[PDB]
Structure formats: C-alpha cells, structure tokens
Amino acid sequence: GEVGSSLADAIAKLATFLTELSPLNAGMLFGLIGTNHLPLLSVSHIANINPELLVNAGFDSDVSVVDNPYWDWDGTVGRTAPLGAVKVVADGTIKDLLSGPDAIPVVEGQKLNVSAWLKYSGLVAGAGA
C-alpha cells in the first residue's frame, strides 16, 4: 500500500481487506437501502423519528457535484464545516443540479418537507420570474 514497505505490511494489508466470506462493516453504508431488501421489521423498534434523506445534502464534500462544468464543490464557502457549498458560473444560461445519491422512494400520501439555505452573490441575473 505504500512505497518502501515490507512483506509484513503486504500481508497485513491483504488481511485488512475484506473478502466475500469475511464480515462487512455496518458503520456508515452511504447511499440508500431499497425497500424490497427489508424482509421483516420490528414493531417494538418502531418509534417517532424524522431523519434526513439525501446523502451529502449539505454539499460539504465532493460527492453529488461530480463531473459538472456548471457546478463545482467549494471548500471555502459554507456555514458548516468544512465550509463546503456549490459554486456556479452563470453565463446567461440555465443551470441544473441533481442529488448524487440515487432515487428517494416516495409513495402516495407520505407528506414531505423541503428546505435549503440559498444565497446569490454578484447576481447579474435579470430581474424577473
């Protein structure tokens, strides 16, 4: 894993790697787990919590803005650490941004709330709708 290492470090790295038979950490699991893979829940475990949905919703990292000339991640502008937000060079045109994580599954009913803190700086955009 690094220049100027030893065979002991090599076998240690191979041991640290997790194969098919080896366990898999449940620490983070970024992304979103589908519904059809959840066979049985727990009624006792059911309770009243409303968590966030999107991953990297605060734009504090490089994810969800990858391969986009219009929008890029910024590590110096942001209210929360590491002060990361989205930057766009609006050259008189239309700009679009989508969530890096895949589809959020919603169904009929099941009301949703959407919020975000936006700030336009140096807006030369025409005063209109």
Next chain:
Amino acid sequence: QFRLRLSVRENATGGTVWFDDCSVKKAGLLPQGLVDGLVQALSDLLTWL
C-alpha cells in the same frame, strides 16, 4: 422515485448561487388508512352514535 432538482432558469444572466443545509424529510406520522379495517370500525362507531 424522487430526486431534489435545483434549477436556475434560463432567463438568468449572471451571479453565483450557493446552497447549504439541504433537507428533504419525509414528515407526518402513521396514516389512518394503513391499519386494518380501523377506519371502517371508527367510522361505524361514530355513525352508530
């Protein structure tokens, strides 16, 4: 399926827009029409009275 669309329309002509603390949350509580026949039973009791 749902995604968060963030669109600056075409009529815009300049500026840089920043976004932070995006939060799309499923809100509410257990819907009435998910428990078994309870809607019908409660309606029947109320209409009986």
Next chain:
Amino acid sequence: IGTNHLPLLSVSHIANINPELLVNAGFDSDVSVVDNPYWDWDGTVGRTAPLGAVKVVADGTIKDLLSGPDAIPVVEGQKLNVSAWLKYSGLVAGAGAGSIRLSGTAYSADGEVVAYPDFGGIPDGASGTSDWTQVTGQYVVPAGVTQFRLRLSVRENATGGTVWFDDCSVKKAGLLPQGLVDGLVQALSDLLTWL
C-alpha cells in the same frame, strides 16, 4: 444500520418481533473486549458454546467495560428491558453496596452522558461466591436522549474476585405507541367523551 439510510418500509412487512440489539452480546467471541488490560475474553467459562465470557481481576479498584458495537439509537417512549447472567468467583471484594451495577450509557444528540440508569446488579454486601444470576431492568427513556450503549460497571469499593457476564440482552419491548397514528388518539378520546 442507521435510521437515516432507511427511506421507505413495507406495512405488510411490519410484524411483531423482539430481536436482540447488541452484537456479540453473549461475549462468545473476542469482540467487544478489544484493547483492554482490565477485561479479557475467555473460552473456557460460560454456558453457551464456545463458553465465551468476560474475565477480570479486581485489584481493589473500579471497573468499566464498553460494548464493542457502537451506540444503539434509543428514543423517547419504546420501553426497553436489560438482562444478563452474572457471576462472581472468589470475590474478595469489600462487602458493601455497589460493585456490580448492570446499567447503560445514554448519549445525547452530540453523544453526552446524561445518567447512569442501573437496571440490576448485586445488593449491599459485595462478597462471597454465586452462580449465573439474572437481573432484569425495565428502562423508560426520558426526553432528549438519542443514543444508547450497554455499560458494565463495578464500583470502586470492590477489592477482589473474578466477575463473569454472559447472555447479555438489551431489547426494545412493547407495542405500537398510541401517539404515532394520525389523529386516532383525538378521535378515540372524542368518541369516549361524547358517549
């Protein structure tokens, strides 16, 4: 698996099951006793295979042990029950009130300890020898608590012996809380009061 990673459930898939919460609760393997000169894992004393339990020596001091898996997400309501089969062999600990106190660590939103809710343990007069004994504790979650862990605590007055713990079980128990279905509480109250 965290809560925020589960977007949508299945009403039909909802059912009645009370499974274990912690991982390696019975101490049957080396996990959860990692990097500790105080406690160690044992494969020769226990009940369930491979007879894995926790060994320890009480050199006149206090003792603590943390669960290997991370914080259990605990929330208001949804009562819990904590149990474990404990034993003390050759306990030269001081005969007093304390020593074994089976309890949990309730971390706040940022992960701050709020209380030491003791769900069981030995009574006053901590001395002698016993066998696998179960202490049952029903815990009701106060408000403003988000994370839970199972702590193994032995008071500082202990002065000897080897303490064994096995078959640990912290379970979320109960049924659907009344105040989660939409307007049903108000409707049922209205019907009863109308009658």
Next chain:
Amino acid sequence: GEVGSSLADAIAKLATFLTELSPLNAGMLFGL
C-alpha cells in the same frame, strides 16, 4: 487486473480495492 497493463492501472486497481475504512456503496446489497 489485466494482461499488458501499466503501473498506473495497478495503482488504479489498488484504489478500487475496498478496505475496512473505505466507504461502501449501498447500490444493490443483494439478499435480505
């Protein structure tokens, strides 16, 4: 990972290797 490649491809495969500390995609997770 392929015959007739370079050390750049070797280190790219090393990067694609997922360790315990590496983030893990929740793409499919086949099973239950």
